[PDB]
Design a protein around this motif. Structure first.
Motif: not given
Ligand SMILES: [Mg+2]
Lengths: 10, 23, 550, 16, 101, 1328
Positions: C38, C42-43, C45-46
């Motif tokens: 995850d 998450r990275n 998506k950032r």
């Protein structure tokens, strides 16, 4: 506290 | 938008437009 | 993404931003297919969010991404906003066809509605019209024949060009365009040369002087544009200032100097006391060297008054005047009193003449009167022979004695200060006061010396007469120069300021005729640099204010 | 002090 | 591009795909001149030329479908086209089209 | 007097002797580059400094390391002229010797296991031309010196314009040469805070905790202690006399006032004072106090002592209490209050705070925090306070030691803080940021060194990374270094920097001013929008260092300055000016160079100060300046004097005659516009000059100056050959000096550069004599314009405003005719369809346009070409093109169709007519050379062979002349030698050993001569015949040079030296022009009205002096014409040169008859007169000169109108003025466009004359049209002229059809904007 994604990643 | 300005020579022209939109 | 010379390609930053967005999106899909921790998702998506915000608005969210040239990439928001944005660089202002630009000279032979245009410039600007007329009159079978005919520059091409611009108005503009008088319509007259010839009387409307200024020219195409130029934008129509209603085509410089010199009065001139039948006989006497321009004579003047109700009353009578005043009355239109001309004519007097002509006669009469006024002013300024020389800067003999007195009493007050009677600030203030008083008195003495002379009349008695000094005439006529300029030329430069605002105790005691030494020039530069910089910044401030007001 | 004053007047700036 | 940063390279790039206005006017004049020249020719013959070269129509046609109009034989279509060109290089009716070369 | 000066002696009107001649004008560039490029053993400047700062470098583990030994510069591949021709950078190879030393892991560290010596290539270093320029890509460029702020610490304030009240906040700021910036400011609450590279404020105490300072140590450093004691059960206070100078005072013998002077009672001196308890209540502690029994802290440092605290310390047994000192005027509690507001309590709590404010949103660790604070200021790699910076810091904080250090330490920070608190307290003042002692000059050498260090570091990272790998047995030093990064850095600096500017080459003055220019902009400098009034202002320290007049008029006002005449740079980069010492009341000739700091204390007199015969001052009170303020000071108090009257002004301002009579505003314009002058066909001296022209002409380098004295052996318009004198010969030298002159070479601004010989064969010359005159030079004097006859009067409105009326005669004799050389290039490239060819077979072009072309398709040399003519014929392959059906029918009727290739050929630009003077063809290696290429190739070989043979012949002639003299030391007969043929001398047979040995020596010398000539020829042939390195994809380049003679015409801008500019309005016929009683007409009629308002009175004085000088010229002309006796010629010349009480003593008696005749011949066209700035000719001298020339003393003549023959009513000022033709020509400023190219995206007309673009109708033009009410004209400009594609096409068609109507549409820019707004996820649409 920060806006650079690199620092959050580290 | 390249149309005539509602001032001076074009003024009457724009008036006609609100003569048409009212009717 | 287009090629340049040598195989190099030129691209836009939007390509890089879009490529970043697509790459990060595809990597996100790949990471969602190959099940990843995850933290990595998450990275990713950032990164996707950062790339999209950078594409939409670079630099708003944080550090702006830079390209290979180490400068920030410019995004859609930057391409729609700013001084260089689409609204201001391409929508409210555009580059236009049928336009030209050239250095401007002075045409003293032109009328108020005429402008001198180069032949080559008009040939380039009016090319489609020349093609159309060559096709119409049959000198060219097709359009390529007309193209080669124009390129080879035949004579009938020049005749066609003459007939094209016969009554085609052209718009002249000078940057900056502070008010609507900065663009005006003129009738072109072809001239052999490379510079546009401009009527002097419109220069004040353009704020144009012939030191290297350039003007742009635009060609209206449709009939509506031509009639707008002829009716609204024509220079003859706009001779009143829209800001205040006063005339804007008032004469200046050599016209004012000539009208002033022709209307001056001299004691014991050739032909004094003669009787003349009218302005024609005054001109005849002047041309025959019988009487001078400044001879005091008696002239029979026929004068017509147009009242407010329109009554036209003509009276002929004997008036004491000068020869030059009658020769100037020769060109004054009917309907004005002779009292407007029976005086020495400075800038204010000529402005009053033009205002009265407009108020009581109209527009066409005003234009003709202005043209004749400027012709006559130029002619008699040339005939006057007014020259500036080193002997015209008379320095009063009282200046040296007054400087000596001021210096001696400065020594006295400094000695008194050493005795402790008064403080330093008081001493500074009173030294400044005495130097200001000395400057004022020296200026007054120089003005009194420069403004008058002694002559011998017909009876032999010494008489007091106004001076015919060149610099005095220039300043008094209002053509150029003021009392302060003469004060620095022939009197005292005065007190100058340290560039923080403070006034130096010692002033400059030398004018420009005698010259300055090193420190006087250094103090002068202190204020000169400040003046230049203040003008430079104030121009931009005024431009921003006028944009906001518009 | 002339053009700043005009700009302040037309901007309706509050005095200090 | 320049000491003042206002200017950029992008505003010094031309558009090479545009058609010069003189060329468009020449094309219109050529269409008019071709129509004038062909109007002095017989209906069948001008039709043969027009719908062989594709003038005022969407497509072009070869000899076969031009023959299929009335006379299916191809050689007559060729001969009538040759007659078209033969009369079209007469100095009485060919001076206007000469200036377009 | 030198021979060139002796030919034409200029009369000097100056009165003050000159002690120090003006130094070389281009020293600021040459000295800096010599510092950069020469090897210095101390290793403090240039390449050695960078190498020692970077090398030696160490692997992280420590196996091996690389060491620097020495460096050298190789031989250039090409010379300057060759580099300009081909288009390459003139540079030298950098070859550096390095040692790769490998240690032993098993052995203790520091054992040398192996060494490897090798030379490595480190790139090409561009070289500085002898005139101070660089040749980058074949272009002459100048690197402008920069004015920046010196490294160190500066103290400033907000001047009470930040807080609501006054409350002037104080700040201190340290800036290094490289590293971080540190700020210590004050807040409105009087607590000092800290910033590290301009981030959020922190309390100050942290910066000391990190240095290992406990609280008590901090109060010890920043405060003074007052002590109290319990003596005899009473409070005892340690009295200090200075402190006391509201309670009852002890010492009953000398009781002072009680709760109601000090010095009188303190004269006796006592030590015991008793104070009430309250005196301690409001006072803060200073030392942490501990009780042994309790083991706790009773009172802490920086805590206010209370009564309860008094009780605790009474029971604890402590008797001595030291506390701080706090006042409201002299001392302050600032440090104590800052400690109170501090939140950190230990060193670690300090470094964590520094880490959070350094890297917000990062977890803080101890090791990272320690490394970060060490690297911020205490690390040599990231922090370097340079030698200048260290000196400035030491002088500011009053520190004497640590001169070599470049890193900060505890003492530095504590001293900066101490000075900040002192400046707050009232002792000390802030620094003037605009003071010239706080601003430094950074020249080309320093900048090149910095960029080279950057390149070294970029290489060095990779070198260190590689060395850590460990496998190093087969490696060499040259395998570790990549020269590409360092080369990239140096070419970055030399080609893309703001301060590496395109050369100004209109005239020698432009070049000299460009080389002596200082810019506050550029890297590490200012920005135009961020520059205020203060930085643009004239400071009192600019006297003698920066010219107050010469500065650009515009947005760059005050940001670009010019060096003063005598200004110099010291070893630290601070401008200094010379002064004459005054010793024992005499004004000595010894000269001392003073900087801004040293100048303040001394009082300095002026060059205008009167002097006596003994050398001392005459006036008892003299005008001087001290500390920046001028005033009147006693004679005995004067220390220094100015060396010259032109010390404060630049060269351009020094070239303005009668400058003291001109306003500074107009002097600025005159100085700026003297640099825009264009050289003419014939160079004419200024009749009224300043005596500076010779220095500018000699130091510019445009002229040919004699390296050694001798006699001119040969003169030709392209070559001067000088026979060197016997006393000035190197042993074993040829004795010939050859000067090859530049002929018609294009300048950077498309102006002719031509050198014309001014010598004759056989005349003697000496060292420094001018042999040939370059552009705008006349006999070694700068000649920027022409001497024009000027009448000051209005003429029928043709001189209205600043207009100029010029006679046709001026046009006829070509006084203002210029030559412009223009370069046109045709590039044959390689395309996808095929390779473009340079051939004469141009489709659809007849033989009429091919007449000037050769077989290869290149225009001939000497061909008169006009606009549209083909210069180089090129055909480009084209693909299949669709033909419209009408075109297909047209091709069917007439079968002509030849469109395999398209005509893309180089053509002469429109409105350009000239002659082809040079054609150069560059061909890639591997491409066949066309016939023209081999023609030029063989022509170049023929020229090179002929010229090499010529130099060989002259050098052999000189050498054999010297050998003949050596033989004639003994003396024999050369007829017998000449009896044997010259080659047959080598065929002689000698039997005696003495003669045979000499014969062998002669044969060997002949062989060596042959070998050296052969090697020179082979080098030149290889250079000429080799291929050219062109851009990828480029096959051929052809360059054609066009020479255009531009004549004066209306629209051209003409100006003088006093800021009087104008535009020519009419070319009047000669008969119309005013004329005098002798029938001589004037040349230019100027408007007098411009003079009074602009206060440029120097031009009138120049007019009068020119009239007098020309009158003396006609007197000499007549006296020569009547063949009058030489004695009266001498008497007249002596009378002329003795006029006035000047400093010039010219004795005509010591001149020979030929010298006198030559001087008279050079004086026929007028007598040159020198009027130095601020030491010029008075009115009395001008009137005396006019009286000598039999002219009116008023300078006004009676002029007659040419049109009517009638005399003008008043006398008119007639004289001679030096007028210039500025490079603002109406030929280059006309532009007109009907329809042309359009932009790719906006679909709007392009911009500029080069692009054949259209003028911009901006916002204000639209406002004016709206104010008029011309709606249709505005719609025309917006739609059918700019971006309505269909509308503009139909508009053109309608005009061709004679309809004159428009169908407006939507501008393309609006559609683009709609697309952009849609792309931002915003729906913008149109409704019906
Ligand atoms: Mg101007």
């Amino acid at each position: 506290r920060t806006t650079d994604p690199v620092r959050m990643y580290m | 938008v390249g149309r005539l300005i509602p001032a001076g020579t074009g003024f009457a022209y724009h008036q006609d437009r609100q003569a048409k939109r009212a009717q | 993404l287009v090629p340049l010379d040598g195989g190099r390609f030129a691209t836009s930053d939007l390509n890089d931003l879009y490529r970043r967005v697509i790459n990060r999106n595809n990597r996100l899909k790949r990471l969602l297919e190959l099940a990843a921790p995850d933290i990595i998702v998450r990275n990713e998506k950032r990164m996707l969010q950062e790339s999209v915000d950078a594409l939409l608005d670079n630099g708003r969210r944080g550090r702006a991404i830079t390209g290979s040239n180490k400068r920030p990439l410019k995004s859609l928001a930057d391409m729609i906003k700013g001084k260089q944005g689409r609204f201001r660089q391409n929508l409210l202002g555009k580059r236009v066809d049928y336009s030209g630009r050239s250095v401007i000279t002075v045409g003293p032979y032109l009328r108020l509605h005429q402008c001198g245009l180069p032949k080559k410039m008009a040939l380039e600007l009016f090319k489609p019209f020349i093609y159309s007329k060559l096709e119409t009159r049959g000198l060219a079978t097709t359009i390529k024949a007309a193209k080669k005919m124009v390129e080879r520059e035949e004579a009938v091409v020049w005749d066609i060009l003459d007939e094209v611009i016969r009554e085609h108005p052209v718009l002249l503009n000078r940057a900056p365009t502070l008010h609507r008088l900065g663009i005006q319509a003129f009738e072109p007259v072809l001239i052999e040369g490379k510079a546009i010839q401009l009527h002097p009387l419109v220069c004040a409307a353009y704020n144009a002087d012939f030191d290297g200024d350039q003007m742009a020219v635009h060609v209206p195409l449709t009939l509506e544009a031509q009639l707008e130029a002829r009716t609204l934008m024509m220079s003859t129509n706009n001779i009143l200032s829209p800001a205040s209603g006063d005339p804007i085509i008032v004469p200046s410089q050599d016209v004012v100097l000539g009208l002033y010199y022709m209307t001056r009065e001299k004691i014991n001139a050739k032909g004094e006391g003669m009787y003349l039948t009218g302005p024609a006989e005054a001109e005849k006497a002047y041309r025959t060297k019988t009487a001078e321009l400044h001879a005091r004579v008696k002239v029979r003047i026929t004068e017509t008054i147009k009242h407010e109700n329109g009554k036209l009353t003509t009276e002929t009578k004997m008036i004491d005047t000068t020869v030059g005043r009658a020769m100037l009355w020769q060109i004054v239109p009917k309907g004005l009193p002779y009292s407007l001309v029976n005086q020495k004519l400075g800038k204010k007097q000529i402005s009053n003449l033009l205002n009265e002509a407009y108020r009581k006669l109209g527009l066409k009469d005003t234009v003709i009167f202005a043209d004749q006024i400027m012709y006559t002013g130029f002619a008699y300024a040339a005939l006057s022979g007014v020259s500036v020389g080193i002997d015209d800067m008379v320095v009063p003999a009282a200046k040296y004695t007054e400087i000596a007195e001021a210096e001696e009493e400065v020594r006295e007050i400094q000695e008194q200060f050493q005795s402790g009677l008064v403080t330093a600030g008081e001493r500074y203030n009173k030294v400044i006061d005495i130097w200001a008083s000395t400057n004022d008195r020296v200026a007054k003495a120089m003005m009194e010396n420069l403004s008058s002379e002694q002559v011998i009349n017909r009876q032999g008695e010494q008489e007091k007469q106004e001076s015919f000094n060149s610099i005095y005439m220039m300043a008094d006529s209002g053509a150029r120069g003021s009392a302060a300029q003469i004060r620095q030329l022939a009197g005292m430069r005065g007190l100058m300021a340290r560039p923080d605002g403070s006034i130096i105790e010692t002033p400059i005691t030398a004018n420009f005729k005698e010259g300055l030494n090193v420190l006087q020039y250094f103090i002068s530069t202190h204020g000169a640099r400040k003046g230049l910089a203040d003008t430079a910044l104030k121009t931009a401030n005024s431009g921003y204010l006028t944009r906001r007001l518009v | 002090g002339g053009l700043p004053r005009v700009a302040d007047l037309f901007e309706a700036r509050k005095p200090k | 591009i320049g000491d003042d940063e206002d200017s950029h390279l992008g505003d010094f790039i031309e558009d090479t795909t545009l058609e010069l206005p003189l060329d468009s006017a020449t094309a219109t004049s050529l269409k008019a001149a071709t129509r004038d020249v062909l109007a002095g020719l017989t209906p069948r013959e001008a039709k043969v030329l027009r719908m062989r070269f594709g003038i005022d129509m969407n497509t072009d046609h070869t000899l076969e479908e031009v023959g299929k109009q009335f006379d299916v034989t191809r050689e007559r279509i060729r001969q009538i086209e040759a007659k078209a060109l033969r009369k079209l290089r007469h100095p009485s009716r060919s001076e206007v089209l000469r200036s377009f070369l | 007097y030198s021979y060139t000066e002796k030919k034409r002696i200029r009369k000097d009107f100056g009165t003050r002797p000159q002690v120090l001649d003006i130094p070389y004008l281009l020293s600021i560039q040459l000295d800096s580059f010599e510092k950069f490029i020469e090897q210095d053993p101390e290793g403090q400047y240039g390449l050695e400094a960078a190498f020692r700062s970077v090398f030696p470098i160490q692997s992280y583990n420590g196996n091996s390391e690389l060491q620097y030994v020495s460096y050298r510069l190789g031989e250039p591949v090409f010379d300057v002229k060759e580099c300009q021709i081909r288009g390459v950078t003139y540079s030298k190879p950098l070859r550096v010797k390095l040692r790769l030393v490998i240690f032993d892991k098993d052995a203790p560290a520091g054992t040398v296991k192996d060494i490897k010596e090798q030379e490595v290539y480190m790139g090409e270093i561009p070289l500085m031309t002898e005139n101070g320029t660089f040749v980058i890509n074949g272009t002459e460029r100048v690197i402008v010196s920069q004015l920046h702020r010196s490294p160190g610490v500066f103290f400033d304030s907000d001047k009470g314009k930040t807080h609501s009240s006054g409350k002037v906040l104080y700040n201190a700021r340290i800036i290094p040469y490289r590293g971080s910036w540190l700020d210590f400011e004050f807040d409105p609450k009087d607590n000092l805070y800290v910033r590290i590279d301009r981030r959020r404020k922190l309390p100050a105490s942290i910066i000391l905790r990190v240095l290992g300072k406990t609280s008590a140590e901090i109060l010890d450093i920043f405060f003074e202690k007052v002590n109290f004691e319990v003596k005899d059960q009473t409070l005892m206070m340690e009295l200090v006399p200075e402190r006391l100078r509201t309670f009852d005072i002890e010492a009953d013998g000398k009781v002072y006032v009680e709760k109601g002077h000090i010095r009188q009672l303190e004269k006796d001196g006592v030590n015991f004072i008793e104070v009430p308890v309250e005196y301690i209540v409001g006072k803060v502690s200073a030392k942490d106090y501990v009780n042994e029994a309790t083991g706790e802290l009773i009172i802490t440092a920086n805590q206010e002592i209370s009564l309860e605290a008094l009780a605790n310390l009474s029971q604890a047994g402590y008797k001595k209490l030291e506390v701080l000192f706090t006042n409201d005027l002299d001392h302050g509690p600032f440090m104590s209050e800052t400690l109170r507001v501090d939140s950190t309590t230990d060193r670690i709590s300090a470094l964590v705070e520094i880490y959070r404010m350094m890297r917000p949103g990062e977890p803080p660790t101890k090791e990272a925090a320690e490394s970060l604070f060490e690297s911020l200021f205490f690390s040599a790699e990231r922090y370097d306070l340079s030698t200048v910076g260290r000196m400035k810091f030491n002088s500011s904080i009053g520190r004497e030691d640590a001169e070599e250090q470049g890193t900060l330490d505890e003492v530095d920070i504590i001293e900066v803080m101490k000075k900040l608190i002192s400046i707050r307290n009232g002792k000390g003042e802030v620094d003037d940021i605009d003071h010239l002692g706080n601003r430094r000059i950074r020249s080309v050498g320093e900048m090149a060194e910095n960029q080279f260090r950057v390149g070294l570091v970029r290489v060095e990272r990779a070198v260190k990374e590689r060395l850590s790998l460990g496998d190093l047995d087969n490696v060499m030093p040259q395998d570790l270094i990549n020269a590409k990064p360092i080369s990239a850095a140096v070419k970055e600096f030399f080609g893309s920097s703001q301060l590496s500017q395109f050369m100004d080459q209109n005239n020698p003055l432009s070049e000299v001013t460009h080389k002596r220019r200082i810019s506050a902009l550029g890297p590490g400098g200012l920005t135009r929008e961020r520059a205020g009034f203060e930085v643009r202002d004239v400071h009192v320290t600019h006297y003698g260092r920066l010219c107050p007049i010469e500065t650009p008029e515009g947005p760059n006002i005050g940001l670009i300055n010019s060096l003063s005449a005598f200004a110099r740079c010291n070893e630290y980069g601070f401008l200094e000016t010379p002064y004459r010492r005054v010793v024992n009341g005499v004004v000595t000739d010894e000269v001392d160079y003073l900087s801004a700091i040293e100048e303040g204390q001394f009082v300095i007199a002026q060059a205008n100060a009167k002097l006596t015969e003994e050398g001392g001052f005459a006036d008892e009170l003299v005008t001087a300046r001290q500390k920046g303020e001028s005033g009147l000071h006693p004679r005995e108090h004067v220390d220094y004097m100015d060396v010259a009257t032109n010390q404060v002004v630049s060269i351009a301002a020094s070239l303005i005659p009668f400058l003291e009579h001109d306003d500074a505003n107009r002097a600025l314009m005159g100085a700026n516009m003297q640099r825009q002058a264009v050289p003419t066909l014939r160079s004419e001296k200024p009749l009224v000059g300043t005596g500076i022209e010779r220095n500018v002409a000699v130091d510019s380098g445009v002229t040919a100056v004699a390296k050694r004295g001798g006699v001119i052996q040969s003169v030709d318009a392209s070559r001067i050959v000088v026979k060197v004198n016997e006393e000035e010969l190197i042993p074993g030298e040829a004795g010939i000096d050859i000067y090859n002159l530049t002929k018609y070479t294009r300048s950077n601004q498309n102006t002719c550069i031509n050198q014309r010989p001014c010598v004759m064969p056989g005349e003697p010359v000496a060292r420094g004599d001018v042999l040939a005159d370059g552009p705008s030079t006349d006999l070694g004097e700068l000649a920027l314009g022409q001497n024009m006859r000027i009448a000051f009067m209005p003429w029928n409105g043709y001189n209205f405003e600043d207009s100029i009326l010029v006679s046709e005669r001026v046009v006829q004799d070509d006084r203002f005719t210029t030559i412009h050389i223009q370069e046109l290039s045709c590039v044959a490239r390689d395309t996808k369809l095929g390779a473009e060819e340079i051939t004469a077979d141009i489709p659809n072009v007849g033989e009429a346009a091919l007449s000037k072309l050769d077989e290869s398709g290149i225009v001939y040399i000497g061909a008169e070409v006009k606009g549209g003519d083909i210069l180089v014929g090129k055909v480009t392959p084209k693909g299949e093109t669709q033909l419209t059906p009408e075109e297909k029918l047209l091709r069917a009727i007439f079968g002509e169709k030849a469109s395999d290739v398209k005509d893309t050929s180089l053509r002469v630009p429109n409105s350009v007519a000239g002659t082809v003077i040079d054609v150069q063809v560059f061909t890639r290696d591997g491409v066949e050379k066309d016939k023209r290429a081999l023609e030029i190739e063989q022509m170049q070989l023929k020229e090179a062979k002929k010229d090499l043979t010529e130099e060989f012949q002259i050098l052999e002639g000189g050498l054999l002349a010297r050998v003949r003299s050596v033989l004639l030391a003994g003396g024999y007969t050369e007829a017998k030698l000449s009896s044997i043929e010259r080659k047959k001398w080598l065929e002689q047979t000698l039997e005696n050993e003495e003669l045979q040995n000499q014969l062998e020596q002669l044969a060997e010398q002949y062989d060596e001569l042959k070998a050296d000539f052969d090697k020179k020829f082979e080098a030149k042939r290889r250079k000429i015949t080799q291929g050219d390195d062109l851009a990828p994809g480029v096959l051929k380049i052809v360059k054609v040079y066009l020479a255009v003679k531009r004549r004066i015409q209306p629209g051209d801008k003409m100006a003088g030296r006093h800021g009087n500019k104008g535009v020519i309005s009419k070319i009047n016929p000669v008969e119309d022009m005013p004329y005098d009683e002798n029938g001589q007409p004037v040349d230019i009629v100027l408007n007098p009205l411009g003079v009074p308002s602009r206060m440029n009175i120097g031009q009138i004085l120049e007019v009068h002096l020119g009239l007098a000088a020309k009158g003396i010229g006609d007197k000499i002309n007549q006296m020569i014409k009547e063949q009058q006796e030489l004695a009266k010629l001498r008497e007249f010349l002596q009378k002329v040169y003795d006029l006035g009480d000047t400093r010039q003593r010219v004795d005509i008696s010591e001149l020979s008859d030929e010298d006198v005749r030559t001087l008279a011949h050079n004086l026929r066209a007028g007598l040159p007169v020198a009027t130095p700035v601020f030491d010029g000719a008075p009115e009395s001298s001008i009137k005396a000169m006019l009286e000598l020339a039999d002219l009116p003393a008023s300078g006004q003549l009676t002029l007659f109108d040419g049109r009517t023959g009638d005399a003008f009513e008043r006398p008119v000022t007639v004289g001679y003025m030096y007028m210039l033709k500025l490079n603002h020509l109406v030929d280059d400023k006309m532009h007109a466009r009907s329809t042309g190219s359009y932009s790719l995206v906006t679909q709007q007309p392009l911009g500029g004359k080069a692009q054949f673009g259209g003028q911009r109708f901006g916002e204000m033009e639209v406002w004016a049209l709206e104010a008029y009410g011309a709606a249709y004209t505005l719609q025309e400009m917006l739609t059918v002229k700019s971006d309505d594609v269909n509308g503009r096409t139909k508009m053109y068609k309608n005009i061709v059809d004679g309809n004159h109507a428009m169908e407006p549409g939507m501008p393309e820019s609006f559609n683009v904007l709609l697309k952009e707004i849609r792309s931002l996820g915003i729906n913008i649409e149109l409704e019906d």
